[PDB]
Structures are given as structure tokens and as C-alpha cells.
Amino acid sequence: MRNRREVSKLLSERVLLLDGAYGTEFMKYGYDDLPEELNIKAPDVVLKVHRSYIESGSDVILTNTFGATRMKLRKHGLEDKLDPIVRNAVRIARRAAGEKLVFGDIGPTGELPYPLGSTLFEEFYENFRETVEIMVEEGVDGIIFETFSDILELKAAVLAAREVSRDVFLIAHMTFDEKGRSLTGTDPANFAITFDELDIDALGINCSLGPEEILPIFQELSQYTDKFLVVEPNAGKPIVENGKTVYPLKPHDFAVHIDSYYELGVNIFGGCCGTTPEHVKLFRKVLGNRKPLQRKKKRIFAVSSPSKLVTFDHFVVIGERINPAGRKKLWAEMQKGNEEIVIKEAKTQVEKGAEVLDVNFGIESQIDVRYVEKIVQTLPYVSNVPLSLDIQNVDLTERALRAYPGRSLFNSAKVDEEELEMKINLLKKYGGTLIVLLMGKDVPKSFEERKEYFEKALKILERHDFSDRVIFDPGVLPLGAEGKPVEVLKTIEFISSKGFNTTVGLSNLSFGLPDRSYYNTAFLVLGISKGLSSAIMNPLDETLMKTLNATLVILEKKE
């Protein structure tokens, strides 16, 4: 009925009240069946629960479709009822809602992404796409992905939804434990930074914890996004009384927290498991009519994996090793679709100090795109760290960005209008940061020429509103080919002075020469002294890594 611009307008004018729990309510009516089944078996019960919230003052109610996706329904022998379950649910909610908003509610599948589970990004995507299709056809005022525990699964859900409709208001939620971490390790800042740049309309948190515990987690989230915010705490932490589980937080003790969420910029407030019509009735009285607060957001340059957020506020070691060039064993295995060998190189580099891993597949026309898609999804989970996607083919780049679990660093766009625009557009759609290589047709041979490319890059970047998502690579050329490293050091110092992060493919300096390690170490020390913020380098080089540590200690960047 209403599109995202209209819902956004309404939210900009007033904080809305969502509804309470459905799963924890159906039992009080004598129905302990799977919630989604009632949409067909006892639609009357679903209608009653929705009306109890509308009659309690809710401005928005959720469809009874939390577990209504093929992958989840298949687990209860209901996959073939997906269509009626979802169409009925929406209709029932629409009848109860009248003029109020109805959001299509979609929860996770219960299946972990490969390699923890067996599911690839593409299957999650199709799964969510089908449910969203039905909801959009039936006329929802928005889609909310509730209770997500993994960022890759949630990214597939939001991308599938946006692909079905560019006009539906989309809300993404993750649920966090007491330590402020989702199941696969994502903290609130990581969730915010990763998802703030995707085309969603709002971010939020629901379930797992009560209103008191969610407060600092919601605060962290609010500081890193300017999108609309939603929260639905459980009515206190669940405790056992007589074999069963109960949510003990009463209306008043729950309601008293509304003001504190209002202060942190909340736009929609509701409750999850344990919340009843009685809680909602009180929330309505306490919330009243309020205009949401403003906040903007903290700006940070960071990349992520499900469990790690790497901020560029210290020297970042980017492992160069997953790169087949000049590596017989590795290159052979890549063509054979060998995963564990790349996993071994990933883990070893991280053990040695790499905080991000560059990933390159050599002659891409010789590699299975399915293998790329699998490696990109896998390394962040098993190696734990973010990736620098060193990919040339633009179509292959889109595949890798789509399935990347977090916010990646995309390894380079040269300063060429067409290439940059093409890469900037893929990043805008799938999220991520970009390494911009300071060269074009030819390779610059001086500082002045590199500076010209820098300034041209800034022009093109300012034009596509992308100046805050790049790292500059001056372009290190072989010493044994008149690379003139001195001109690169000048360039690093100049870009650093301008406030931008920098990086270099360090080992290039010494290829062709003997004692590579010493030239590499010497250059890195000099570069770091000029402001170099990262480097694609060999973390397995003990001399290089030890001297790097000594360098950082000496310069007061650590001890």
C-alpha cells in the first residue's frame, strides 16, 4: 500500500509503536502448533492476536510469517504450503490493520552459511526472494528481517528483497547475545557499518535480551548509522519456573525504558518474545506522540568479516599470499577447485599477523566462477578476517561482492572514468571500499604525475559521492626496472598529509632482485615513516614482520 518514501515521511514525523509477540502468545489461546500453520489451520486465532495489538494502539503489525520461507518450512514438512501460508498471513493482517501499517515479517532459516553449514549465498538469496515476491504481491507496507544471527544470510535476504522491489521499505535486524555478538561473531558497530551502506531503510535489534541489556548494544548501533532505527526487546531474559520458559518483565518495568530508547534516536518501538497486548497498551500511553530525534553518525574507514571489524587507525597488514602468480603448487590446485590449500594459506598468514587477506585467482578465465564464489564466502569464516578482493573481470567482481560476508576492500580501479564508475557502482550496490591505483593508460614515472592522477581520482570520486570509501595505492614498480621508489615515498607522504589511507603492493619493489626481503623491509620502514597505512605484503617473512613490529614500537604506535 505505502512505499518506502511514504513510510520514511511518516517516521520522520513520529515515533511509531510496533506490536508484541505472536509465538509466545498463541499458546495462551490453546494453540501450540507451529505459528505459520495457523494461517491455514486456524486463521481465526491469527486474526485475534493481530486485533489485540491493534486494539492496544500499535501503528504497525507484523505478518505471521516469521518461519515462512521454503528452507525453513521444508523442515516441518510444509514447503509446498508456502504460497497459501504467506498469502493468507498478509490478508489476515491486512484485515486486522485497517489503516495501520502491515510489515511482512521474515526470520532466518536455521541453516548456517557454508562452511559452517552447507548453504551457499545463492540458495539463501533465492529462498528469501520467493517469500518477498508473495508479500509484495499481497500489498505490504514494508519488509522486516527479524532475529538474524548471521550477516551473510541477512545480506542475502536484503539483496533478494531489494531486487524484488526497489520501493518497499526494508528493515534489517540482527539479534545479539549478552556480550553484544551475533551467533557468527558480529558486533553492533560491524552490523551498522556493513549494512548502513546497503539500500535498506532501517536497522534494528530484536529478541535474545530484555530492554535493559539491549540498551548499550542499541546505542553502539545508533552511533554508526543514520538510517531509521527499530528495537523489539524480549520481555526480560527468559527464566524457568515449572519446566517451561517465561519472560518475567511486567508492563511498567518494560515501558520505563522507552524514554532511553527515544534519546538514542529510535524510530519504531515494539516488543518480541514475552511481550503481550497488556505491555503494548502501556507502551502506547507512555510513548505518546513524539517526533524522532536526530543524530547523524560517526565516520570510520573499516572493512569486515562476520567476526572482525578492521579499522584503519593503525598499520594494517594485508597478506599477499593467496595469489597463484609464480606458484606452481598453488596455481595447479586452484584450477582443480582445491579449497583446503587456500584455507591453509589464509590461516597461516593470519596466525603470522595478517589482519586482512588479499585474494587473487590468477588467470581468471581458467578458474571456476563457482570456486571463486565459494572461496569468497568461506575464508572470512575460517580465517576470521576480512578480504581484499583482487579481481579483474568485472562480472566476476560482481559475483564476489554479492556473496562476500561483510564489508570488503576491493582491490583496485585504475584512474579511468569508465572503470572507476563501473566499480564504484558495484560497490554502491553491494557495499565495500575501494583501492584506487594511481595510474591510467600508462604507469606514472614521478611524484607529479602521480599527484595529477590523485587529483583526477578525487574529481571522479567527488562526482559519484565516493570520496570516503577509498584507499590510495601509489603503484610500486620494480626497482630493477627503474621503479624510482623515492617518487612513491613522496606520494605516500603527500596523500597521507591529505587525510587519506594508503597501501602498496610491497613485494613488487624487489621482484627480479636478490635478497628481496631486505629491499621489502627497507621500503616498508621508509613508507610507514611517511604515513603509509597498510601494505599488501608477505606475513610469512619473519625478518619483514619483526622489523615492522620494531618500527611501530619505535614510532609509538604500539609496544
Ligand SMILES: CN1c2c(nc(N)[nH]c2=O)NC[C@@H]1CNc1ccc(C(=O)N[C@@H](CCC(=O)O)C(=O)O)cc1
Ligand atoms: C602488484 N601488486 C599489487 C596488488 N594490488 C595492489 N593494489 N597493488 C599492487 O601493486 N596485487 C598484486 C600485487 C601484490 N601481490 C603480490 C603477491 C606476490 C608477489 C610475488 O613476489 N610473487 C612471486 C614472485 C613472482 C616473481 O618472481 O616475479 C612469489 O611467490 O614470490 C608480488 C606481489
Ligand SMILES: N[C@@H](CCS)C(=O)O
Ligand atoms: N515476530 C516473531 C519473532 C520471533 S523471534 C514472533 O513474534 O513470533
